[PDB]
Symmetry: D2
Subunit: 244 residues, 4 copies
């Protein structure tokens, strides 16, 4: 099954046309959506005007287990992967624009698997050995996660990182600045300008995102379903572990 | 005259609809365009499929004086066929351009974007003591062989808005050690490129952008691989910058 | 009264010879020691082999009011037997110590040094616009619970010299993003620890140092492994810092 | 032969007593001086007031080949000597002729100890880095040199480094900042206060140094002989190479 997929930026993001999202999508459509999500890291559906609160939730249950029963309304300008201070953080979110500012209000995502790939090989080999502590709860995650479906390595960082384990504070900051800098390099990101009825889904195992705060008092209301994720595995097979 | 103007991001960038760019635009149109440009810092016109190389150049001349290997059949049009680094144009010279008019000829199907940053918004958001420090700094800008000394804060000649004048041609902040110069540059430049002070544009063939080089930096995203990307540009001559205390930039080397 | 004073480094530190420290020092001697301390920021007395726990404490009371597990047979003496990180003492509180008197009891045969930095010299060497910025900054100090807000520039209550108040208890500079706070800290702290503003002392048993905590930071070098190192300290109570515009530090969490 | 050696700081520097330096020192004394130099990285001889200019040079020829050879000497910046050339000096012999009454110190850092204290994943990365050194002559040196006598690995950095080969400018700055910051960590250094007639000898393969500029116009006069060094060898046995 080939969806009508239109890549947005060169290294991340794709709009999918010709699909009306709903709890009744057939199994091939869902699988092609999951494939497009792994490949493109964030995917977009425009004009989902029919998709009410109940129908977003039931569509979401097709893609994983949610963490109306699960639909949250949000009425975050710092780069982060979702809830990484816990051990088995979300694998994905499904996010629908309900009220969109006439100007401003964008969201940006970064492709943390492309960020990992572009490091020189000695620097990839360092990153493969690093562990960081993430805090709001404190959890230790490998800096490099091996994705459980695609096997792609991705950098696991963002603003919940409190420090890189086994380094002085100064060295931790330098190493984080280098690796996080590759994440948010413009070439690894896609920025989306929302219209009401847009839906984005991203793979939280291989992205970070950032909500641009440039819209002043213009109202902005989005509704989110989050899907439950797995314990990260590092390159040498070790798993993340909550410590506090 | 009120053009049909649609802001793109909340602090920079606006698309103008209903205007077919050409050498024959009337005075009110040209003046409303010049006003939108100062206000929004970079403006966009889509669907300019009629606008060829001669017509782009003639349109340009309505906005200022084009600056002199050019596209055949023109005197000022440059073709660009990579610049993924934030900068204001040609700031290693003293009176660097005030604007460019850039047309998309061939646009990658994915990738290829250009991002602009509002250096006036970036200056305004600094805490007061930091604005006061920025008001005093001078930097040396270089193409490395030209070196020019500009104030870090330029008072815009039309709007009087103050804007940070930094970007990749900055060689160092005059009067500081190297380490101090890098930290201070990193602070001020980081406000320029903060997402909130930027707009990103995804080009389609026939798009034209015009930006105020006195109050922006830009960056071309190199994420498109071997997909052909071809744009053509006319640059307009600008003035010698004036700093907050009235002093002027000055070239110091060749 | 002129003491036998011998500068150690160009910009900080002096050994004073011909003085046996004790609780019985006359007023002229004590006054000349206090002036030496203000002037040189840390002073050194070697060969104080007669100076035991009680007599260190009695000598200390001639300089100020010691601040309240102490060494047995004393009220205020603290034994240290590691802090290899630049700091001014106890700056997470409001009226932090003005001085410490530190005696070497057991000194490693190799390693074990202490280094002090002159934060008054560090302030004076900054370019004027940067001193003007520092004169306006405030920082939050924390023990990692007490949080206190101090001006970055303290006007010394005896000499009037301005000095940077920073070091490892700084949590952040008030009014700035985190990245900006980091850069600004790094610049100003970097002038503090520039080698030319420091003096390093290699201890022998019976050495005593006294330093002016209002105008220094210090760092104990941890290069001596398991060689025993034992020093004993009396700390003297300080005043509430006053900034350049006369405002006072203030505790904000206790 | 055991010389009378008194270590100065915990991890570098030793004063050697009871030796009058001259061109006539015997083979056992020379060899025990060479061994002390390798072990402690910089060594000091005080009270060498007999030692004039010709005598300094003749003493130096016992340690290696000078590059007729005494230079009279501001360099307040951390560096290893002449690293912009391929076979930079292995050592210098420096005598204080006039010494400021206060100020005028020199500091040395042990780049072998600085390498060893890095966490193992970071040593493994440093083992793979090359840097370009320039007198703006440009030479490419491994960031880690294997010492040709002791086999100790040492960081080869300092102010002559223009960039770390293969990295963007930002990454090069960060990685240099981490590795050079270990070099200049106080624990890895020794600061010497000079008296007229003091002689220092340092192993320029495993140190950097810095002349403190805190003495104003007090006259300071030092005289130096420099000894020829070998082409550096990296951990995988590759040799440095001049490129410009």
């Amino acid at each position: 099954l080939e969806l009508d997929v239109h890549p947005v930026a060169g290294r991340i993001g794709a709009e999918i046309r010709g699909v009306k999202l709903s709890p009744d999508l057939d199994a091939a459509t869902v699988e092609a959506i999951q494939a497009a999500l792994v490949r493109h890291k964030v995917i977009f559906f425009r004009g989902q005007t029919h998709l009410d609160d109940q129908s977003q939730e039931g569509f979401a249950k097709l893609l994983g287990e949610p963490v109306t029963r699960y639909l949250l309304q949000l009425d975050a300008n710092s780069w982060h992967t979702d809830v990484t201070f816990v051990e088995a953080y979300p694998k994905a979110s499904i996010l629908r624009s309900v009220v969109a500012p006439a100007s401003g209000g964008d969201t940006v995502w970064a492709n943390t698997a492309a960020a990992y790939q572009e490091l020189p090989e000695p620097l990839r080999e360092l990153a493969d050995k690093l562990w960081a502590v993430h805090s709001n709860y404190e959890t230790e995650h490998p800096v490099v996660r091996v994705h459980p479906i695609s096997g792609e390595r991705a950098l696991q960082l963002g603003h919940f990182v409190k420090r890189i384990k086994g380094y002085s504070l100064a060295d931790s900051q330098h190493l984080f600045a280098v690796l996080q800098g590759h994440v948010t390099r413009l070439e690894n990101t896609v920025r989306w300008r929302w219209e009401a009825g847009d839906v984005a889904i991203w793979d939280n195992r291989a992205t970070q995102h950032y909500a641009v705060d440039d819209y002043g008092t213009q109202p902005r209301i989005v509704r989110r379903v989050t899907l439950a994720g797995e314990v990260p595995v590092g390159v040498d097979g070790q798993l993340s572990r909550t410590t506090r």
